[PDB]
Amino acid sequence: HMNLCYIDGKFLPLEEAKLPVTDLIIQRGVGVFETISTHSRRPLMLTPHLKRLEGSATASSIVMPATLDEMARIIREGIKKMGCETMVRPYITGGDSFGKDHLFSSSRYFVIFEEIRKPDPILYEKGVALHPINAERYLPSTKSINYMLSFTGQRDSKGAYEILYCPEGEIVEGSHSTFFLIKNGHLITAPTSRALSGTTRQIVLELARRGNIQVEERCPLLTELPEAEEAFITGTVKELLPVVRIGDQIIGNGVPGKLTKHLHQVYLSSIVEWLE
Amino acid sequence: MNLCYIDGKFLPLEEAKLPVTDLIIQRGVGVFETISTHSRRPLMLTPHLKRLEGSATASSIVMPATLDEMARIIREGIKKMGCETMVRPYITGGDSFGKDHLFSSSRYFVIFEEIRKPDPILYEKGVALHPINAERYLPSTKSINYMLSFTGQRDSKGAYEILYCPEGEIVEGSHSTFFLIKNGHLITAPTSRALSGTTRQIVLELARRGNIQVEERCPLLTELPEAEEAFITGTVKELLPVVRIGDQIIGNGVPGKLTKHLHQVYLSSIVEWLE
Ligand SMILES: Cc1ncc(COP(=O)(O)O)c(C/N=C(\CCC(=O)O)C(=O)O)c1O
Ligand SMILES: Cc1ncc(COP(=O)(O)O)c(C/N=C(\CCC(=O)O)C(=O)O)c1O
């Protein structure tokens, strides 16, 4: 199906939807969003995503322009119209003004609906490279629209798949992904005091609980990578994507590892539990 | 009325729209400049447009128009406004990042608004800043990312502006160059750390003319109790006195004599840089 945008009460073809230049998302980068994906055309972790969207807006002093029930109504209606596997992005804008009450009270919203684009199967076979940077995401619980560092930082990337935020040599997360390290057959991942509360992350920790795999919620260190067996990044579109290189450092023997492939299989076998 | 130049026309500002496909909207990929007028002439027009090109190039965005063309639009829009104007040319990422790692379908538009100077009372009383432990990444680049300038005013205590103070080193304001005055000297962060402000560049020339010493280092939050004065600079706000940073009063909590002197010399001198 054609890509859609829900804006001003209607589903438009995506390429026709426009936003007023007065909006502070355009002028000043004031915006939050979510990415929601489907399996068998059903939305995965819809409620957790919409609660995260509200968290992002409230933490950003943005007054929600619609109820979560209303956003869920729109998202379901658009997925039905797409009739295929879909990546859905609801956006909440700052709107035209920051009031004397220090809130954005005229927020706009729109929802993008696109045919899903999974990473190429070769990337799951070979794994990917990450480019570490000495930077952090501010207000890391908040998912804002600001991804400019993910792009401008590709000059020095050496064709890395994704940037990895490594402030002072402590690995937190990717620009689009949760990061997991594997040492001694268990999982190391940054705490959500420092990293986004990923929906895929939440599911992987539940799968680890079910499988009696130990999870340490601490920032893995760049200096620990020589001793690691495996690594992977997570997100709703990419699922579990093996990581075989970070900077100049090969992870383990430089191919996807057995615990990564195991968790990926259990994820896909289990996924129906979290569809809405 | 306020205007936006977009797709070859001056529109009423409130009617101009941008495709939601644009990565400025989806991913915050955008750069811009703020240019202000005195006597209907843009101040430091060429320095601003050189900064805009620098921002775009540093961000892998291919210029969608020449600087001469942007200068032409800006002058025509100032003439159409018929008042003192704040002008903001924007350059967007456009719809795609190519295999060549460039934004090659950049869009652009130019906002013209009647200027809004800080109220005269703010120059008389000075303003408060809210310090935060954060930095602007790629600080020479002026991107559209000002989200922290707002969201970081949660516990602001009614501060005028946030001040980037990473690890207690003062760099700059969210919209401003920061200057500390100590022993009759100016202290301001080097351009390795802070935006190369146009107002900043003029104030350093005014310091040279007045034999006022400038130290290009980050003032520390711990130095503030020994400071005499502070001010912030930008093309709209000129020199705006700072009398409080966080809980710390600056000097005796009113605008200082060197700030008021430099502001007077600035107003007398800026004709030199009107274009
Ligand atoms: C900063 C950050 N960390 C982690 C994640 C992963 O969270 P979740 O597992 O809930 O998707 C995302 C989502 N990144 C996406 C899309 C998801 C994907 O990467 O597949 C984004 O919306 O940009 C993210 O933007
Ligand atoms: C991060 C930052 N630093 C410094 C400056 C001061 O530069 P200049 O002296 O060239 O104006 C600005 C301008 N910020 C503005 C306008 C503020 C003003 O005009 O007073 C802005 O649009 O955000 C800025 O955004």
Numbering used by the authors:
A (entry chain A): 0 to 275
B (entry chain B): 1 to 275
Publication passage describing the model:
AmicoTA is a transaminase of PLP fold type IV, which is active toward D-amino acids and α-keto acids. Transaminases (TAs, aminotransferases, EC 2.6.1) are well-established in large-scale chemistry. These are pyridoxal-5′-phosphate (PLP)-dependent enzymes that catalyze the stereoselective transfer of an amino group from an amino donor (amine or amino acid) to a keto compound (ketone, keto acid, or aldehyde) to form new amino and keto products. The catalytic unit of TAs is a homodimer, with two active sites formed by the amino acid residues of both subunits. Each subunit of the dimer consisted of two α/β domains: a small domain (residues 1–114) and a large domain (residues 127–275), connected by the interdomain loop (residues 115–126).
To shed light on the substrate binding mode in AmicoTA, the structure with D-glutamate was obtained at 1.9Å resolution. In the complex D-glutamate is covalently bound with PLP via Schiff linkage. Considering that the dihedral angle C3-C4-C4′-N4′ is 60° and 40° in subunits A and B, respectively, the adduct between D-glutamate and PLP is a ketimine rather than an aldimine. The occupancy of the adduct was found to be 0.7, the rest of the cofactor was in PMP form. The pyridine ring was tilted 15° from its position in the holoenzyme around the N1-C6 bond, and the released side chain of the catalytic lysine moved toward Y146, forming a hydrogen bond between its εNH2 group and OH group of Y146. The α-carboxylate group of D-glutamate formed a salt bridge with the guanidine group of R27* and a hydrogen bond with the hydroxyl group of T34. Backbone nitrogen atoms of V236 and K237 as well as the Nε atom of the latter coordinated the γ-carboxylate group of D-glutamate. Neither K99* with H101* (analogs of the “carboxylate trap” in bsDAAT) nor R116 was found to participate in the substrate binding. To summarize, no canonical “carboxylate trap” was formed when D-glutamate entered the active site.
